[PDB]
Amino acid sequence: MQYKLILNGKTLKGETTTEAVDAATAEKVFKQYANDNGVDGEWTYDDATKTFTVTEGSHHHHHHMDVEGMTSLKVDNLTYRTSPDTLRRVFEKYGRVGDVYIPRDRYTKESRGFAFVRFHDKRDAEDAMDAMDGAVLDGRELRVQMARYGRPPDSHHS
């Protein structure tokens, strides 16, 4: 039986198989592989796919002085060729983004170029706002700053 080991480790994330005569035999070889590489994840075996999953996220609970989340980011100098999916795809790399609001203003087709992106927590936004201030989505480095505005009035309707 060729068992698949799902390396969901902090060190690695890969897949491997061994021709094992038994699940107990397979898990040993997987344990060797995991232990040698340096992943100590929650051993969970799935019979359906015959896979051994070691889930190792490693977050702990010692680090947390955070307060408020759902921070919005402000991207400016934004190109009008930018689609909402575009920023969402980029920003989600820097942090856990929930949704993005790239306004589609047809009143000023060339005046204000801005968009908003809404992240999980400030922790996610910090990496994003700092990084993407100077990020090129196509032919423009976006002006990404932290937009901690309280209550979007949305009164920008011409």
User: Which is it for the CA torsion 64, 66, 72, 77, positive or negative?
Assistant: negative
Same domain, residue pair 116 and 54? no
Question: Which one of 63, 86, 111 terminates a domain?
Answer: 63
Question: Beta strand 42-46 with 141-147: parallel, antiparallel or unpaired?
Answer: unpaired
In terms of Cα–Cα distance, which of 50, 35, 32, 41 is closest to 10? 41
Distance CA 138, CA 29 (A): 47
Give, in degrees to the nearest 5, the angle at Cα 46 between 44 and 51: 90
Experimental technique = NMR
Place of tokens 């910090």: 126
34 and 106 inside one domain: no
Question: Does residue 69 share a domain with residue 2?
Answer: no
Helix axes 122-131, 84-94, angle to 10 degrees: 110
Residues 110, 133, single domain; the answer is: yes
The whole domain housing 85 covers: 64-158
* Residue 81 shares a structural domain with residue 147: yes
